[PDB]
């Protein structure tokens, strides 16, 4: 009934269609256990959301680098920010570890004990750190505009859109990494080269991706 | 069943204790797949030489078939719209889609007419049979509306196919040995049938 | 009931209850009621500041020319110090804003004057105070609210048009309209920039650099300057 | 009742309800009826714009046989009043007015019978008896029976679609207009053939317009 990643094969028994982006794609059966599938759903959403945020950063800084604004390219951006500002590297990395470890550990122990971060132990906050579903923490802070508690079918549509855009941005970031590792250029410079010569400037002419 | 002339000296269509890819359903189906690809191969390896000898296509084209870019040691052709690897990746994606949906109809009969494929689902319902799907595109004109006419057309497809398979093995053999094209071999054997044979080119 | 698209259907949470309700919510940002109260208040406040802003820019360019409204904060002069003006604005706006926000979060709890206990503001709705805020009303509120939200949406669009036209042309709104009347075919946003898959061209920014005020050196960037046509 | 080929059985959803129905759908694209309605509207749009384009290229080449419609789009090749015009402002006019009329017809497709009335002047209305056939001020002479005229309309339109993509194809191959190419084939039919002129695109390779360079496109790798 529902479209499978590979038409003709039936989907596996542990992938039913209740999840967003459920195409029955598990050929290595990594999520047969429901707890492992729950944990992988939340890991997929976290990787996807970081990839969407990262890919938007790549694209906007590369637009601002091709148009003459003086923005670095993303493989030089961290070095030029640390060196042009008054920033020491390891202190900013440790402050990142502090803030991300706090938030991340709240996420970890809300996976473990599902309603437990809404006890009020963090400063006074109650039901604003309670989750709605697995990996969907919508209260007043994380869903301030409040789309998950009105028009539930439209919210299911947004869950589908979020999972699809996240998978697309994960393969796009793997893109940017591979594109840079092959060509040694900015990715929107690579896009400009492909728009210049489509038939002749590509991965079959980089001399790396197919070494024959 | 099409082309059943009883010729099986090595007994490979035995239904008793079969399996794997040696099977009547796999062997007859791969027989018609090799037959159709070899008909296209025979026509495609003839056509530039005869159309350049007839004066219809120019002399920048009409090259020998092994100098097309199949074997760049044998010679390549600059004048395509891209490099042959740029061509070959499009071939990978396109033939992957085609051959892979064909494989899925072989493994699950009729399963290629449910999941959305741009409205192209009634075209790929197939039949209760591999190797002969039909439908509004694989049978454009309703040819073989009679069952006996359908058997006759399947048998003609089998015979023209086996002839083209022998012909394509011929094109490979002649191309390796005498180093020329098959229409050039026609010209030499029709010029001197005595002094231009396999026995001369050794 | 007129719509943003005549013939379509409005979303199920939009009925026609609020003024200016024409069924326009494609993202579904008002399906929560508690959110929709906050966004109605924010729409009214953005609309009123934008109407007063467009009135200020128009009357400023009419009355006092050779003063560019994007640079009035630079080229203004006063014996009133900049930090003194900013401190007065800070405390007085913090006062007024917190009074209005308390009326939002607790409906009708700051009606009474704190200094003069005689004067109390009458019961009302949120966003529409009344009383001494509205001494004179022409006609009925059922149409004036619609007029207010329509003029306010049009003036919000007008203010972002003023900002973009000032950053792209470098002139005021009346001077830019005189430019578009002097060359309508040749002075449009289509006529200044285009992106083609070959090459792309953006207009030069007419706001130069970090502005040198009295030692602060205010950085002045243009809005989304890499994404203009 | 005749079909597109002898011996071919028409599909079950093709019956004779729509005009120009020869039972021809080898890809099964109209198997879903909502998609069939969308492709009927797209067929009508392509047919009417192609009839307009063929009548265009025909009359333009007849009246002014020095235009060369394939290069008529340049700013220099414009008529008497505005012949160095700003193509930005021209595209601005076209974008606004076409976006208007197009969204009106799109809402006609989405809600049939909902954009018949004039929104400004409330005493005006077009009765559309079928989708894609507005009538009223769009049918000022009013010959609408309607069915045989719809068949004539879709047959002329399919012939004009084939004829206009023919026009573009010949004009890219031999570099001339349709009447000039017909005169060349009447001059010699053996020379100046499709057997000879093909393989070379006369496409002038990224014409620089006033500020920008458009990338140019031939339908086959001729060069
Ligand atoms: C929708 C109908 C329509 C069709 C079939 C064409 C077709 C054409 N236009 Mg035209 N145009 C059309 C609408 C318009 N054109 C123009 C303004 C131009 C200009 C300025 C130019 C053309 C050019 C061309 C040629 C295409 C060469 C090319 O680069 O294409 C393949 C590539 C892409 C489409 C990208 C061909 C004659 C070019 C030309 O005449 O030189 C060959 C050219 O320089 N057109 C405007 C005003 C904005 C149009 C309105 O919609
Ligand atoms: C762009 C695609 C996209 C979509 C469709 C969603 C959709 C959703 N998010 Mg997700 N989210 C995203 C990106 C997206 N998100 C990213 C990149 C992050 C990391 C920052 C998150 C982090 C996140 C959290 C922490 C939470 C959600 C939640 C939700 C759900 C309800 C909130 C909502 O409806 O916003 C709809 C989203 C949009 C309309 C996208 C706006 C597009 C922007 C404006 C593009 C421009 C941004 C760019 C920087 C410039 C809904 C399923 C909440 C939830 O699950 O509640 C139960 C929740 O708590 N998301
Ligand atoms: C070396 C030991 C060995 C032996 C004794 C067998 C024996 C068998 N295999 Mg197994 N098999 C082997 C290795 C072996 N195989 C390997 C290495 C693979 C992985 C490729 C397989 C994968 C495999 C499959 C998928 C199948 C079999 C099947 C069979 C059975 C029938 C095959 C037959 O006669 O068809 C005749 C053989 C052919 C038609 C193919 C010959 C041509 C291919 C390309 C092999 C060429 C071999 C040659 C040495 C290569 C020269 C290269 C040089 C010119 C450059 C028979 C029991 C079939 C079966 O189970 O049916 C009951 C079956 O479907 N085998
Ligand atoms: C200033 C911000 C602002 C806010 C908070 C609102 C809020 C509202 N609008 Mg209003 N609207 C605005 C500006 C705003 N509007 C402007 C400028 C126009 C003219 C284009 C309109 C035209 C309009 C119509 C026709 C209707 C509404 C309606 C509504 C209400 C329900 C829709 C909703 O839930 O979305 C909440 C909206 C927001 C949360 C603001 C969006 C914030 C996103 C993240 C920014 C995206 C904007 C994007 C950058 C474009 C900027 C402008 C662009 C031209 C450059 C809600 C009270 C409906 C109504 O009144 O029914 C009761 C209705 O029918 N609005
Ligand atoms: C104060 C120093 C400063 C300077 C000189 C610049 C300069 C620039 N910015 Mg950046 N920006 C800054 C701070 C600064 N920015 C900060 C703090 C943020 C986070 C809010 C941004 C968010 C931002 C975005 C999303 C984008 C830019 C872009 C740009 C470039 C084009 C101009 C523009 O779009 O306006 C700036 C854009 C804004 C939205 C205005 C915010 C900037 C003000 C000054 C922030 C002040 C807040 C601070 C706490 C006080 C230009 C080089 C564009 C670009 O080309 O990137 C590749 C672009 O897309 N900026
Ligand atoms: C507001 C500035 C602006 C202007 C005036 C244009 C104008 C144009 N664009 Mg561009 N476009 C723009 C922004 C703009 N674009 C941006 C910001 C992007 C990136 C999203 C694009 C992405 C884009 C593509 C992919 C294409 C165009 C094309 C065109 C041409 C369309 C002609 C046509 O189709 O008529 C009818 C026209 C010159 C097309 C073109 O070049 O054809 C000649 C074309 O293929 N544009
Ligand atoms: C010759 C091809 C042709 C034919 C047979 C039709 C037939 C029809 N059209 Mg269609 N139409 C056409 C071309 C054609 N049209 C083109 C090119 C366009 C785009 C401008 C349209 C746009 C259009 C609209 C908007 C409408 C119609 C409608 C109709 C129907 C009734 C109107 C009528 O009686 O005109 C009969 C047609 C002719 C007698 C052909 C005239 C030949 C001209 C004069 C040649 C001009 C010379 C040339 C410029 C050089 C009838 C089915 C209407 C309808 O269906 O209402 C219910 C309606 O509203 N047509
Ligand atoms: C049917 C298979 C077929 C294929 C794959 C090719 C392939 C080619 N032709 Mg050839 N050609 C063919 C049949 C074919 N031709 C026929 C039937 C004729 C007589 C009309 C020609 C007459 C011809 C000429 C005069 C030229 C080519 C050229 C070419 C090359 C560049 C493409 C081009 O611009 O030509 C245009 C495309 C076609 C002619 C094919 C369209 C018609 C077929 C039947 C569609 C299938 C390319 C290798 C060019 C070349 O050799 O460059 C140096 C060239 O100048 N062809
Ligand atoms: C499902 C399944 C199932 C079965 O069972 C098996 C198998 C098949 C194995 C599987 C599959 C898998 C896969 C495919 C995976 C992939 C992944 C990825 C790619 C990710 C990424 C992911 C990605 C990500 C996160 C990313 C992110 C990013 C980021 C943050 C960025 C950042 C940045 C920026 C902005 C800029 C600057 O200047 C720099 C940096 C710093 C650099
Ligand atoms: C019957 C029997 C029985 C018993 O039981 C046992 C035994 C004896 C074993 C058996 C036998 C068998 C046999 C004989 C077989 C043979 C086969 C063949 C020859 C094939 C080929 C086969 C072949 C084939 C497919 C082929 C194909 C081909 C092709 C596509 C080609 C293509 C092409 C062309 C166009 C042109 C250009 O230039 C390129 C190319 C690329 C070159």
Q: Which CATH number characterizes residue D50's domain?
A: 1.10.3460.10
Size (chain D), residues? 223
- Distance (Å, rounded) from C-alpha A14 to C-alpha A7? 18
Query: What backbone torsions phi and psi does residue A103 show, to the nearest 5 degrees?
Result: -65, -45
Instruction: Specify the CATH superfamily of domain C33-201.
Output: Chlorophyll a/b binding protein domain (1.10.3460.10)
D169: tokens are 């194809």
The coordinates were experimentally obtained by: cryo-EM
Q: Is B109 helix (H, G, I), strand (E, B) or coil?
A: coil
**Residue B147, helix vs strand vs coil:** helix
- Smallest Cα–Cα separation from D90: which of D207, D203, D210, D213? D210
Rounded to whole angstroms, the Cα distance separating A19 from B63 reads 57
The contact set of D with B (CB < 8 A) is 5, 7-9, 11, 25-29, 31-32, 35, 195, 199, 221
DSSP structure class, residue A73: P
- Alpha-carbon distance of A10 to A24, in angstroms, equals 8
Secondary structure letter of residue A210 according to DSSP: S
User: Which three-class secondary structure state does DSSP give residue A71?
Assistant: coil
Cα A41 from Cα A167, distance rounded (Å): 12
CA pair distance C127, C44, nearest whole angstrom: 7
Contacts of D194 (CB under 8 A, 6+ apart): D173
Strand partners, B127: B129
Whether D111 and C191 lie within 8 Å, measured CB to CB? no
Residues C185, D210: contact at Cβ < 8 Å?
A: no
Length of chain C: 229
Nearest to B68 by CA among B52, B89, B45: B45
Cα–Cα distance measured from residue D52 to residue D113, given in angstroms and rounded to the nearest whole number: 26
* Residue extents of the structural domains in chain A: 34-196
CB-count exposure of residue A153 (10 Å: 0-12, 13-18, 19+)? exposed
The domain of D180 spans 1-223
Output the CA torsion sign for D110, D111, D114, D120.
negative
Facing residues of C200 across strands?
C195
Nearest alpha-carbon partner for B157 in B47, B34, B6, B8: B34
Chain C's closest residue to D117, CA to CA, is C6
CA distance C161 to C182: 19
Maximum CA extent, chain B: 61
Work out the number of other CB atoms within 10 angstroms of the CB of residue D16.
10
Strand partners, D213: D208
Distance of alpha carbon D161 from alpha carbon D176, whole angstroms: 19
Phi, psi of C106 (to 5 degrees): -125, 110
Angle at C60 between CA C54 and CA C61, to 5 degrees: 95
CB A43 within 8 A of CB A163: no
Mapping DSSP to helix (H, G, I), strand (E, B) and coil, where does residue C194 land?
strand
Q: What are the φ and ψ backbone dihedral angles of C200, each rounded to 5 degrees?
A: -130, 145
**Phi-psi label, residue A147: left if phi above 0, alpha if psi -120 to 50, beta otherwise:** alpha
Any idea which residue has 């470890």 for tokens?
Answer: A101
Q: Are D29 and D39 in contact (CB under 8 A)?
A: yes
Strand (E) or helix (H) holding C200: strand C200-201
> What residues of chain C, 93 to 132, have a C-beta less than 8 Å from chain A?
none
Buried b (16+ CB within 10 A) or exposed e, D86-121: bbbbbebeeeeeeeeeeeeeebbeeeeeebbeeeee
* Helical H segments across D12-130, by residue range: 33-63, 87-110
Specify the DSSP class assigned to residue D40.
H
- Structure resolution in Å? 2.9
Return the bridge partners of D117, or none. Answer: D125
Do residues C74 and C211 make contact, with C-beta atoms less than 8 angstroms apart?
Answer: yes
Instruction: For domain A34-196, give its CATH number from 1.10.238.10, 1.10.3460.10, 1.25.40.10, 3.40.640.10.
Output: 1.10.3460.10
Compute φ and ψ for A125, nearest 5 degrees.
Answer: -80, 130
CA D216, distance to chain mean position in Å, is: 20
* Subunits close to A (at least 3 CB pairs below 8 A): B, C
Q: Are A150 and C13 an interchain contact pair (Cβ–Cβ within 8 Å)? A: yes
Question: Which of A80, A65, A57, A52 is closest to A188 using CA atoms?
Answer: A65
Whole-number Å distance, alpha carbon C50 to ligand 4 midpoint, is: 14
CA distance linking residue C95 with residue A194, whole number of Å: 58
Mention every residue, 6+ apart, whose C-beta is less than 8 A from residue B32. B2, B131, B132, B157, B158, B161
Other Cβ atoms less than 10 A from the Cβ of A192: the count is 17
Interface residue A146 vs chain C (CB under 8 A): yes
Rounded to an integer, what distance in angstroms lies between the CA atom of residue D46 and that of residue D158? 9
Cite the DSSP H helix spans in A7-130.
Answer: 34-66, 74-84, 89-112
Distance CA B38, CA B36 (A): 5
Task: Give the Cβ contact number of residue B174 at 10 Å.
Answer: 17
CA distance A94 to chain C (A): 30
CB count in 10 Å sphere of residue C17: 6
Q: How many helices (H) does chain C have, and how many strands (E)?
A: 5, 2
Calpha distance D143→D152 (Å, rounded) = 13
Q: How far apart are CA A14 and CA A8, in angstroms?
A: 18
| Residue A206, both tokens | 């980089």
Determine if residue D197 is labeled as part of a ligand binding site: yes
**Which letter, b or e, does each residue of C101-117 get, where b requires 16 or more Cβ atoms within 10 Å of its Cβ?**
eebbeeeeeeeeeeeee
Taking Cα atoms as reference points, which of A73, A69, A63 lies closest to residue C204? A69
**B24-53 and B182-191 helices cross at what angle (nearest 10)?**
70
B179 in Cβ contact with B75 (< 8 Å): no
Give B157's contacts (C-beta < 8 A, 6+ positions apart): B2, B32, B35, B36
User: Rg for chain B (alpha carbons), in Å?
Assistant: 21
Angle at A167 between CA A163 and CA A169, to 5 degrees: 115
Rounded Cα gap, residues A15 and A31, in angstroms: 9
């Amino acid at each position: 009934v529902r479209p499978v990643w590979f038409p003709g094969n039936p989907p596996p028994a542990h992938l039913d269609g209740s999840l967003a982006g459920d195409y029955g794609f598990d050929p290595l059966f990594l999520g047969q256990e429901p707890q492992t599938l729950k944990w992988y759903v939340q890991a997929e959403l976290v990787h996807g959301r970081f990839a969407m945020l990262g890919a938007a950063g790549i694209i906007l800084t590369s637009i601002g680098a091709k148009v003459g604004l003086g923005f670095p390219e993303w493989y030089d951006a961290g070095k030029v920010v640390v060196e042009k500002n008054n920033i020491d590297f390891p202190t900013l990395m440790v402050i990142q570890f502090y803030l991300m470890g706090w938030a991340e550990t709240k996420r970890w122990y809300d996976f473990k004990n599902p309603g437990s971060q809404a006890d009020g132990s963090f400063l006074g906050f109650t039901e604003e750190f309670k989750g709605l579903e697995n990996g969907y923490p919508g209260g007043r802070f994380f869903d301030p505009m409040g789309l998950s508690r009105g028009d539930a079918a439209k919210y299911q549509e947004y869950k589908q859109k979020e999972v699809k855009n996240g998978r697309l941005a994960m393969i796009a970031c793997l893109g940017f990494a591979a594109q840079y590792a092959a060509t040694g250029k900015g990715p929107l410079d690579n896009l400009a080269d492909h728009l210049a010569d489509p038939n002749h400037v590509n991965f079959a002419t980089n001399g790396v991706s197919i070494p024959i | 069943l099409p082309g059943d002339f009883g010729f099986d000296p090595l007994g490979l269509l035995d239904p008793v204790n079969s399996g794997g890819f040696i099977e009547p359903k796999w062997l007859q189906y791969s027989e018609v797949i090799h037959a159709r690809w070899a008909m296209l191969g025979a026509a495609g390896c003839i056509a530039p030489e005869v159309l350049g000898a007839a004066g219809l296509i120019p002399d920048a084209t009409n090259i020998k078939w092994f100098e097309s870019g199949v074997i760049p040691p044998a010679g390549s052709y600059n004048g395509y719209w891209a490099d042959p690897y740029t061509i070959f990746f499009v071939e990978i994606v396109a033939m992957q889609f085609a051959e892979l949906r064909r494989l899925q109809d072989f493994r699950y009969p009729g399963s290629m007419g449910q999941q959305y494929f741009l409205g192209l689902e009634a075209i790929f319902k197939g039949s209760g049979d591999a190797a002969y799907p039909g439908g509004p595109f694989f049978n454009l004109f309703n040819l073989g509306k009679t069952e006996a006419a359908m058997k006759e057309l399947k048998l003609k497809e089998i015979k023209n196919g086996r002839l083209a398979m022998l012909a394509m093995l011929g094109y490979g053999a002649q191309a390796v040995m005498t180093g020329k094209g098959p229409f050039q071999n026609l010209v030499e054997h029709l010029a001197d049938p005595v002094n231009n044979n396999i026995l001369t080119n050794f | 009931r007129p719509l943003w698209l005549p013939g379509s259907t409005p979303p199920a949470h939009l009925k026609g209850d609020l003024p200016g309700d024409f069924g326009f919510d494609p993202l579904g940002l008002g399906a929560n009621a508690e959110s929709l109260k906050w966004f109605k208040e924010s729409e009214l406040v953005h609309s009123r500041w934008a109407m007063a802003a467009v009135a200020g820019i128009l009357v400023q360019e009419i009355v006092r020319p050779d003063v560019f409204w994007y640079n009035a904060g630079k080229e203004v002069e006063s014996p009133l110090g900049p930090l003194g003006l900013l401190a007065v604005e800070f405390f007085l706006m913090h006062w007024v804003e917190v009074r209005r926000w308390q009326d939002l979060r607790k409906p009708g709890s700051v009606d009474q004057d704190p200094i003069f206990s005689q004067y109390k503001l009458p019961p009302h709705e949120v966003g529409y105070p009344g009383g001494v805020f509205a001494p004179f009303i022409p006609g009925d509120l059922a149409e004036l609210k619609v007029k207010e939200i329509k003029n306010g949406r049009l003036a919000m669009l007008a203010f972002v048009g003023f900002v973009m036209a000032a950053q792209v042309t470098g002139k005021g709104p009346i001077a830019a309209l005189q430019e578009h009347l002097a060359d309508p075919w040749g002075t449009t946003i289509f006529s200044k920039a285009a992106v083609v898959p070959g090459q792309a061209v953006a207009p030069p920014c007419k706001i130069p650099a970090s502005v040198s005020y009295k030692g602060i050196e205010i950085p002045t960037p243009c809005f989304l300057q890499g994404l203009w046509p | 009742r005749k079909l597109w080929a002898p011996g071919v059985v028409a599909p079950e959803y093709l019956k004779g309800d729509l005009a120009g129905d020869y039972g021809w759908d080898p890809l099964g694209l109209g198997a879903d009826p909502t998609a069939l309605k969308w492709y009927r509207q797209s067929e009508l749009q392509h047919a009417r714009w192609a009839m307009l384009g063929v009548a265009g290229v025909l009359v333009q080449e007849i009246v002014k046989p020095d235009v060369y419609f394939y290069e008529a789009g340049l700013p220099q090749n414009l008529p008497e009043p505005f012949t160095n015009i700003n193509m930005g402002g021209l595209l601005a006019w076209e974008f606004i007015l076409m976006h208007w009329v197009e969204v009106r017809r799109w809402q006609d497709y989405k809600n049939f019978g909902s954009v018949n009335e004039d929104p400004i002047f409330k005493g005006n209305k077009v009765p559309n008896p079928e989708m894609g056939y507005p009538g009223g001020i769009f049918d000022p002479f009013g010959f609408s029976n309607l069915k045989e005229l719809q068949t004539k309309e879709i047959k002329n339109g399919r012939l004009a679609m084939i004829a206009y993509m023919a026009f573009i194809l010949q004009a890219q191959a031999t570099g001339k207009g349709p009447l000039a190419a017909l005169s060349a084939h009447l001059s010699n039919p053996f020379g100046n053939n499709i057997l000879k002129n093909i393989g070379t695109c006369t496409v002038p390779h990224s014409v620089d317009v006033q500020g920008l360079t458009i990338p140019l496109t031939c339908l086959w790798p001729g060069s």
